[PDB]
Structures are given as C-alpha cells and as structure tokens.
Design a protein around this nucleic acid. Structure first.
Ligand SMILES: [Mg+2]
Ligand SMILES: [Mg+2]
Ligand SMILES: [Mg+2]
Ligand SMILES: [Mg+2]
Ligand SMILES: [Mg+2]
Ligand SMILES: [Mg+2]
Ligand SMILES: [Mg+2]
Ligand SMILES: [Mg+2]
Ligand SMILES: [Mg+2]
Ligand SMILES: [Mg+2]
Ligand SMILES: [Mg+2]
Ligand SMILES: [Mg+2]
Ligand SMILES: [Mg+2]
Ligand SMILES: [Mg+2]
Ligand SMILES: [Mg+2]
Ligand SMILES: [Mg+2]
Ligand SMILES: [Mg+2]
Ligand SMILES: [Mg+2]
Ligand SMILES: [Mg+2]
Ligand SMILES: [Mg+2]
Ligand SMILES: [Mg+2]
Ligand SMILES: [Mg+2]
Ligand SMILES: [Mg+2]
Ligand SMILES: [Mg+2]
Ligand SMILES: [Zn+2]
Ligand SMILES: [Zn+2]
Lengths: 214, 201, 91, 97, 127, 97, 25
RNA sequence: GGUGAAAUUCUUGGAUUUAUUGAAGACUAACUACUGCGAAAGCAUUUGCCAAGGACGUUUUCAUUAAUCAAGAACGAAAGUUAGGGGAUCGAAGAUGAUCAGAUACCGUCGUAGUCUUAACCAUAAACUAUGCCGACUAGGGAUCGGGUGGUGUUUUUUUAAUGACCCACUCGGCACCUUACGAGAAAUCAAAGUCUUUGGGUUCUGGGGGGAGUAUGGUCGCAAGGCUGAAACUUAAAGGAAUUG
C-alpha cells in the first residue's frame, strides 16, 4: 500500500544545440529530500533517441544517439553528446553476401579535450557494365582504404570540440570525402561512419557547457 | 636471515651539513650508483618512493606504509608487491591488493617504493637435505626442527599419548580456546585438500 | 667425453633425494651459477653472490634481481607496465 | 639505412675505433662525425660531447650497444664510439645524420 | 505530441517479458511478465499468456505517465538461440491494440563475435 | 561405398575449416558442412501489420525487419529444415528453390 | 564389440600384465 | 529458471528484468564463398617490425648441378604429462534432480582436471582425396583465383588525358565444377582409377584367406600413459567388395 507514483517527481529532457528540436521527453526520479535528494543523485543518465526523431526527416531514420545529462535547473535538465550508434536492422541489411566488408577506426582527441573512437563501414559494389557476380577487393585495396579512412577520420576530429564534430557528422561531410579519395582505388558503396563511442571526458566546466544553451 | 637483498641509500641532511644513510629493501633492477627520488612530486621509476595517491592505478609498489609515515609496512618479503586498484580523492584514500590477496585501503599520503622486491623465487628451489633447512633457521630463530606433538607424552602435548600414535580428538581448536589448548588447526573455517581454483573475487 | 646422460651438475647429490628433486634443483642451480650480460659495460661478466644480488666482474655495478636468475619474469612484466603507466603522465 | 651507411664508410672510408684514439682525432679536428653507443656511460658521453663542440664535430648517438656498433663496423669485438676521419663513397656526412 | 517511454520486450523461449521504463532507462515502471498471468510452467511462453501480460502492462502504463512508447524487442541472445520467442509477437500486438502509440522500434538482442563456447558440448544436446 | 563426391559437404584443397555450433542442438559442425539459412522476417507479421500502422505515430513508418544466419547440425537439419532426402540422381542437383 | 573399446580392452590388459610381471623382477 | 513434461536450484538478499560503469579470461560473429594460402598439422579484427614463398614477367645468370628414396632428421589436430602463470567460458571425473523394470547413461543442476599461455615432453587421428612422387601422351564446356599481353571496348571529366574499377579475347600457373567416353573397372564410378595379355618412361612404400592379433617375446623411445619394431602354436570355409532384387 505505497504506490511510489504518488511519491515520484517528474522531469523533462532538453536536447542540445545543433539539431532541430530541443524538446525530448519526460522522466521519473523521486521527491528532492534532505539526505539523498533528487539532484546530485542521478541526472547523469542517457537517452537513446533516433536523430530522425531529433531531426524530423526520414532520410536520417537510422543512426541512433546517446545523450548524457550534465546539469539541471528549474525542472529543466539539459543534455550533451555521449555517443552515436547505428540501428541494428540497417547494418544487418547493409551486410550482404557476394561482396567485401571493410571496417576501420581510430582513437582521437579534440580542442576542447575529449577522447573518442570513430568507426567506419563500407561495401564493394559492382559496376554498371559488370558481368561477374561478386566484386571483391584485392586486400591491398582493403589495407589502403583503411589507411585513407584513418587519414581522413583523424583530420575531421580535433575539430573544435564535439560541437563542430557533431555538425560534421549529421550532413555526412565525412562520408563524401571518404568516397573522394576512395574512388581512385575501388568504387565501393554505402560508407557510413557507423558508431562512435566516448570513453573519456574533461572536467565539468560550467561555463562552456552553457555554450549550446539559450 | 632475510631472503631479500637490502640497499643502503645515502642522502643529504637538509637541515645540517652531513650525509644520512637510510636502509631500503632492494627492488629488482635497482643498482649501485642509481639516483633515487623521494617525495609527493617524484617520477614513476623503479626504486623512487612516492605517496600512493601520486601514482596511477595499476602501479606496482613495495615496502608500503600502513599508516602514512611508519617508514614501511606492507610487502617487504622477497618477490612480494602490492597493486593499487585505484583511489578515492575525497577523504584521499587508496585501495590496494596485498600479497595475501587481501584488499586494504590506506592513506594516499602513505608512501611506497615502485617495483617489486628482489631475490624473487627463492622458494622454488627444493631445500634438499636437512642441513640447508638447518642453516636457514640458524640465522633466524630456534624453531627447527619440529617434533610432532603426536610423538610426545600426554604431559608434553594435547596430541600426546596412546598405544598407537594418533590425535584422538578433532584437531580443529576454537578461537576462544585457551593457552595450552590451541595446538592444531586453529579456528579453521574448513579443512582437507584444497580442491579447485583458489584466490579471490 | 660426455660425463652424465642427464644429472649434469646435479651429479654431486649422488643417488639421494630422489630424481624429481635433483631435476628440479638442476634447473635453478644452472640458472644461478651462470654468467649474464651486463646492462652497462656490455660484456657478460655478471655473476651472483647470495640471493637477489647480481654484480658485474668489471665495472663493479651490482644489480638487485631474482633469487637464482637476474631478471625475473615478474619484474620483466613490471618493467613494461611501469614503462606504460609512466608515459600516461607526459603524452 | 644508417647501418648500411656505416658499412660503406668502413670499406670506402678512413676511421678510428675506440675512446682514446677518437679523442686524439677530436683534438686535431680530424673528426667530421663521431657515433656513440647507447650503452656507453654518460660521463664519457658528455666529455666526448664537449670535445666535439670544441672541434665543431657533429655527433650522432647510435641507438644500440657497443656490442652491436662493433657488429656495425664489421668487427668481431665491440666498440663504444666511432669517429669518421674520411667519409668514403658514403653520404653520411651530409644526410639526416 | 504524446509522452514517450520504452517497451523493451525480452521474448525468450518458455517465458516472455514486457516492462515500460523512462526514456533514459534508469527509472522503470510496471513489469508483469508472462509466467505471471498463468501457471502451467510450460505455457509461460504462450502467445495467449503474452497477451494476458500485455493487458496488465498497458494498464498501469497509461495509469501513470505514458500515452506513448518506443519498443525494443529482444531475444535470449549471447550464446543462445538468438531468434524471436513465441510471446514476442503477441505482446506488441496486444500493447498496440491497447490503443497505445508506437514508433521507431529495433531489435536489441545481444550478438557476440562467436565466443564463450556454447553448452551441450561437441556432440550436441541429443534425445 | 562413397555416396558423395562432395563427401560430407564442400571443402576442397583446404583440409581444415573451423566448426560452428548448431543453432538447435548446439552440436559442433564444420562451417563448410553447416547447412546455412538466412532468416528474413518482419518484426511484425501477417496479423499485426495493420494493428501496427494504425495505432502508431508516423506515416506508415519504415517497417525494419530482422535478419540472422542459421546453422544446423545435419541430424537437426534433417529432422526439420531443408533436407527431405532425395533420389540417387536427385541428390546431385544443387538447385536452391 | 567396438574396435575402439576393444583397443581399450587390450590396452588395459597390457597394463595389468605389466604389473603382474614386474612383481617378478 | 529449465524441459516433451517436471524436479534439483535462485528469490526481502529486491531475485528474473532496467540503467550507468568497471574488472578478468577466451573468442574473432555477420562479411565466409564448391574462395585464398602452407610440406602437412593447420591459418579469418587492426597496425608496426622480422625474415620467408608460389605463380607470373624475363633476348638475365650458372650449365646436367636432377628424379625418387632404406638409414637419419625437421614439423606434427585433440586429448594427455612436468614446472609456472591464468583459470571468464564450456566442462571426462565426482555429487546430484529426474526418466527406466533397472539407468553407473541420454535430458536438468553443481563442478574437479581440462580448456588459455610460457618452458619442456608426448608423436597418435577416418592426420582422408581411405587414391605415392617426377616426366610424357590421350577430350569437349562454360565459371573462378593470381600474373601477363592485346584496345580509333564501356564507366569515373578536368579540357582530353594519366590513372583506378569494369567488359571482351588470348596465354601461362591455381582451387574446382559441368558434359561426354574413345578408354578403364568386379561394379559403385574414374580426365585418371585412361594410353595393361597389343602386358616395360623413372622411383619409393605396403599387401598375399578369415581369426588368433597388432596379442606374446626381444630391442628401442618416453616421467608417465604409451610410440616404433613385431611373431607363433592353435583355430576356421569362408570372412569380404560393388551392385540386383525382395
Ligand atoms: Mg632445537
Ligand atoms: Mg616433524
Ligand atoms: Mg610439522
Ligand atoms: Mg615437515
Ligand atoms: Mg613416545
Ligand atoms: Mg593433556
Ligand atoms: Mg583435547
Ligand atoms: Mg596421542
Ligand atoms: Mg598417525
Ligand atoms: Mg533423435
Ligand atoms: Mg553406407
Ligand atoms: Mg570437410
Ligand atoms: Mg584433417
Ligand atoms: Mg616383491
Ligand atoms: Mg571480424
Ligand atoms: Mg577452470
Ligand atoms: Mg556422474
Ligand atoms: Mg539416480
Ligand atoms: Mg597410423
Ligand atoms: Mg575425408
Ligand atoms: Mg579440360
Ligand atoms: Mg590491359
Ligand atoms: Mg562403359
Ligand atoms: Mg565372434
Ligand atoms: Zn659492467
Ligand atoms: Zn543440430
């Protein structure tokens, strides 16, 4: 005879700057009491919302995002970028037999000091006139492209925080520049940055955290 | 009588013109003539001695202070060492795993010396004859050799006595047992052949 | 000629103590009496006395080490793990 | 490679091996370049280094021990320091070194 | 428009799980699995039981915070059968037909890179 | 006598492949012998396709189905999935349908 | 009986005749 | 929880489930294929370094230096052994819950050794293509891997190139498949298992009815378990192969 719902506090999730909408959803914590309140207790959670929910367009239907929540004010708690994932179904259809899969990654920092690892995935496609049923690569091809992906992936990061890094990914600036250096070796196809994880972060810095808010 | 080589390490007295000679325990790889650095602000190198707070987790240190400034407590034997499993800056503690495997938390201002203690693996060599054992204790104390309590008379021991040589009652003895009672396996929580993976979790 | 088919230096112990003990000893005796390459003068002049003490014939450098060998496997891996962790503090 | 460079100088050039004899070279300025074993002691190094700058001799610190530098010069013994009096067909004097 | 939540349906064999939680995940509400609404102990996975559990699950869901929920369906996964359970389809059908909103759902069941050798040994489970 | 020129199944000029585990009885079995099937099925079905886009947000959405590879043990591939058994000359036929 | 257990059967017996014989050394 | 169904078991210890985060050891999913490579065993995440190799190209160099091989030697899946480390997972042994008439088992639970690695042993697998190696000749077909040659062939535009991918033909050398059969086989089937009574290119090993038996004995190797070598007396008219029909 308790029903914690008669107890639980409510809260609303606010999204960061470079996106379409800042409004996300609701949540449940507890009333804020002396000796383990609702503030410094949790708040640090993350939310997985597809950015097609965040952007609103359906070209972005895959590509999930994790949002870590830093601070809280007045029943309003912001959030920042904890990482990006790929939708399980897309990848699974992205993987087809009769061809070559290619993956590479690199660990890299930024100006506002943040350490992460970005991935990549690509596939070898036939050509308009191509008779043979598979189209694999030469494994010297495969080594070369990773070196190029690595060449290109590192430059884009150390890109002035994750801020400019976040605005880089959304448009797929990366994807195209990959295709650029790539075509001189093998045609391929797809070529998405896939997943990126954040294994380390700097101190709180209340000042710069507010740069995306207003 | 110690299974480990010591190391005489000479400093300068900061308050008086003089040379003051300490006595360390030699961590494997240290050598005559090497420069030893001691303090909160110090490098991370075999033989230098740092407060545990000031070294990153994973660090492997010897002769560490139990209390901060007891001039060393933990892991002084040959081959033994302690590993910092990480810290709590608030109330500035540090957690470690001792050679027993036990996990203790001490002060971050507890000092330790980088590396492991020398003379490692001394125990792997079969003592062979009695004499080797003998001379081992010759320089230790008079513990050797040992007469089985089951070999003496009842006066001499709890185990003593009988027309056959035997213990006669459980050889496990309680903690609250009294002087002259405890001889055996004392406060044993289990007994018999240790079967299976040992260590810890 | 060849003297002993197995026992080697352990031959002094004659028939005693049982084979497995002699074989187990022979490993470590062989390990402790041998001369090692000095990390300083480059000549292998490093020999032993007592336990954990390894000194060099010329150069008079003495390096603390394992009981019957110079570098112990343990320290070997400790060397690297510090070589690792120390580098976390600069780059 | 840098050892390949030395194998040239040794057969096509003029040199001296050892400590005292390169000090002789350093004082007469006959040394264009000297090379130092990574395990050679530091005091000796700084002395060699001092004489060098007084001879305006460039100094390359070989990464490896005297054992290998001896194998580097094609000799069955070891050498702590090399001096180049005359660079032969080899380019070591004007190069990365 | 609505107020979102996460369905997170774990459907294994010989039982089926459905519980809504906060979109962050740390806070959960109203579980009531399939073995709850019947005890035959065999029938723990049955689609008819899964619907019975989705009935008590959707009830509280709209009785506290949520008019809408994103779902994540999941199988046993890891070294196990990796395929959908019986009471997976039934639960979604029964929580959708409870009027509640649905959008952007995916399959979260755990996929290893072939390790931790499977049970039953080399000769397999045989009877 | 030999009943198959493929023997168990196709491996030629290799001599060791690596075993997978049956998705059914968990029996080990070489990947070359595996009897593999793609599982392509919607998250929804024939019944719930309507009830999906009806009570749900978005314009009909996407409908992102699920895909995984299956591996069977023979004895478990014979017990259920594509096997049957075939005549002398019906065996040879590699035709999928 | 299976060749492999018949191989086991003779392997054992070879071992016991071994014992019994060595007693006579 | 687990199963055909159950039970052993786990659950005021918030079990199962959720979330963030961390640790340990193992494995390399999907891509993975009648695809690659290595003497075989065997080998699938990245990168750096260390050496190795085939096929190809070649109007380069040497010039019979080769073929195959008792003795002898290098390697050698798994389990197994010694000495450390590791010990997640799975898991002979053992203990259990069930099923059975019994059920030392199949199924369920617990779990020792093992599994992983270092040093040293062990040297067996249906280690299989149940098919020795070098050379020659004998027949048709479209695929595919690697190398090369040929072009007023396509696709990438920048201004045409050059490149890269791709298409067509041709040729060496691969992994294979198809169709024929001149031919071969006891047959199943075989581009070798063919060019064998019209019997001879070179060369190594093994077999000689079925049991007894890979037993006994000796020698040799190994820490062990066991490896190599390896009989006989006696017994018995069949054992056996492929195919046909029930
Ligand atoms: Mg005494
Ligand atoms: Mg005694
Ligand atoms: Mg005693
Ligand atoms: Mg004793
Ligand atoms: Mg007496
Ligand atoms: Mg008494
Ligand atoms: Mg008593
Ligand atoms: Mg007595
Ligand atoms: Mg007794
Ligand atoms: Mg069956
Ligand atoms: Mg048959
Ligand atoms: Mg096979
Ligand atoms: Mg094989
Ligand atoms: Mg006797
Ligand atoms: Mg992979
Ligand atoms: Mg274990
Ligand atoms: Mg049992
Ligand atoms: Mg029983
Ligand atoms: Mg054999
Ligand atoms: Mg085979
Ligand atoms: Mg042909
Ligand atoms: Mg061409
Ligand atoms: Mg015919
Ligand atoms: Mg019979
Ligand atoms: Zn020396
Ligand atoms: Zn199976």
């Amino acid at each position: 005879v308790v029903d914690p719902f008669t107890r639980k506090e409510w809260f609303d999730i606010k999204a960061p700057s470079t996106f379409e909408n800042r409004n996300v959803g609701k949540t449940l914590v507890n009333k804020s009491t002396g000796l383990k309140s609702a503030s410094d207790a949790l708040k640090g959670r993350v939310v997985e919302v597809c950015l097609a929910d965040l952007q609103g367009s359906e070209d972005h239907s895959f590509r999930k995002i994790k949002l870590r929540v830093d601070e809280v004010q007045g029943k309003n708690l912001l959030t920042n970028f904890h990482g990006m994932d790929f939708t399980t179904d897309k990848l699974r259809s992205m993987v087809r037999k009769w061809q070559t899969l290619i993956e590479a990654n690199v660990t890299v920092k930024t100006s506002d000091d943040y350490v992460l690892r970005i991935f990549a995935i690509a596939f070898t496609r036939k050509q308009a006139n191509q008779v043979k049923r598979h189209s694999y690569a030469q494994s010297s091809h495969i080594r070369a492209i990773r070196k190029v992906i690595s060449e290109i992936l590192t430059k884009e990061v150390q890109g002035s925080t994750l801020a400019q890094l976040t605005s880089k990914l959304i448009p797929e600036v990366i994807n195209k520049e990959i295709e650029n250096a790539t075509k001189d070796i093998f045609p391929l196809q797809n070529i998405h940055v896939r997943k990126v994880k954040l294994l380390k972060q700097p101190k709180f810095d209340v000042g710069a955290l507010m740069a995306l808010h207003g | 009588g110690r299974g480990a080589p010591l190391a005489k390490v000479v400093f300068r007295d900061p308050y008086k013109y003089r040379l003051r000679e300490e006595i360390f325990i030699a961590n494997e790889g240290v050598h005559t003539g090497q420069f030893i650095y001691a303090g909160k602000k110090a490098s991370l190198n075999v033989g230098n001695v740092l407060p545990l707070g000031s070294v990153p987790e994973g660090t492997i240190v010897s002769n560490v202070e139990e209390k901060p400034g007891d001039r060393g407590a933990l892991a002084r034997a040959s081959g033994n060492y302690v590993i910092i499993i990480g810290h709590n800056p608030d109330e500035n503690k540090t957690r470690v795993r001792l050679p027993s495997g036990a996990k203790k938390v001490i002060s971050s201002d507890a000092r330790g010396v980088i590396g492991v203690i020398a003379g490692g693996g001394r125990v792997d060599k079969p003592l062979l004859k009695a004499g080797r054992a003998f001379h081992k204790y010759r320089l230790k104390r008079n513990s050797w050799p040992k007469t089985r309590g089951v070999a003496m008379n009842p006066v001499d021991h709890p185990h003593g006595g009988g027309n056959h040589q035997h213990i006669g009652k459980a050889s496990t003895i309680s903690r609250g047992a009294v002087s002259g009672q405890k001889a055996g396996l004392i406060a044993a929580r289990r007994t018999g052949l240790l079967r299976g993976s040992q260590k810890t979790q | 000629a060849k003297r002993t088919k197995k026992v080697g230096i352990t031959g002094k112990y004659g028939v005693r103590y049982g084979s497995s003990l002699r074989r187990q000893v022979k490993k470590l005796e062989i390990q402790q009496h041998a001369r090692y390459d000095c990390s300083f003068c480059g000549k292998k002049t490093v020999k032993r006395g007592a336990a954990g003490i390894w000194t060099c014939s010329c150069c008079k450098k003495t390096v603390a080490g394992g009981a019957y060998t110079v570098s112990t496997a343990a320290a070997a891996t400790v060397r690297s793990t510090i070589r690792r962790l120390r580098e976390m503090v600069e780059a | 490679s840098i050892n390949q460079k030395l194998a040239l100088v040794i057969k096509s050039g003029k040199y001296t091996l050892g400590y005292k004899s390169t000090v002789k070279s350093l004082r007469q300025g006959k040394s264009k370049l000297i090379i130092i074993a990574a395990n050679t002691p530091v005091l000796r190094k700084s002395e060699l280094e001092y004489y060098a700058m007084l001879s305006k001799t460039k100094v390359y610190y070989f990464q490896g021990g005297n054992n290998e530098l001896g194998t580097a010069v094609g000799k069955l013994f070891r050498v702590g320091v090399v001096s180049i009096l005359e660079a032969g067909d080899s380019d070591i004097l004007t190069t990365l070194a | 428009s609505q107020v979102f939540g996460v369905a997170r349906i774990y459907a294994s064999f010989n039982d089926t799980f459905v519980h809504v939680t906060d979109l962050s995940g740390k806070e959960t509400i109203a579980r009531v699995t399939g073995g709850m609404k019947v005890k035959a102990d065999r029938d723990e996975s049955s689609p008819y039981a899964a619907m019975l559990a989705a009935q008590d699950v959707a009830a509280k869901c709209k009785e506290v915070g949520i008019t809408a929920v994103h779902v994540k369906i999941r199988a046993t996964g890891g070294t196990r059968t990796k395929t959908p359970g019986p009471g997976g389809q039934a639960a979604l059908r029964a929580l959708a037909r409870s009027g509640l909103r649905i959008g952007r759902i995916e399959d979260v069941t755990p996929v290893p890179s072939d390790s931790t050798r499977k049970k039953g040994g080399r000769r397999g489970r045989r009877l | 006598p030999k009943k198959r020129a493929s023997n168990g199944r196709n491996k030629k000029g290799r001599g060791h492949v690596k075993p997978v585990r049956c998705v059914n009885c968990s029996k080990s079995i070489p990947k070359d012998k595996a009897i593999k099937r793609m599982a392509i099925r919607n998250i929804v079905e024939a019944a719930a396709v309507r009830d999906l886009s009806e009570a749900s947000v978005y314009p009909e959405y996407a409908l992102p189905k699920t895909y995984n590879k299956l591996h069977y043990c023979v004895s478990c591939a014979i017990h259920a999935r594509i096997v049957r058994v075939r005549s002398r000359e019906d065996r040879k036929n590699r035709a999928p349908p | 009986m299976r060749a492999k257990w018949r191989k086991k059967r003779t392997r054992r017996l070879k071992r016991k005749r071994r014992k019994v014989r060595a007693r006579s050394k």
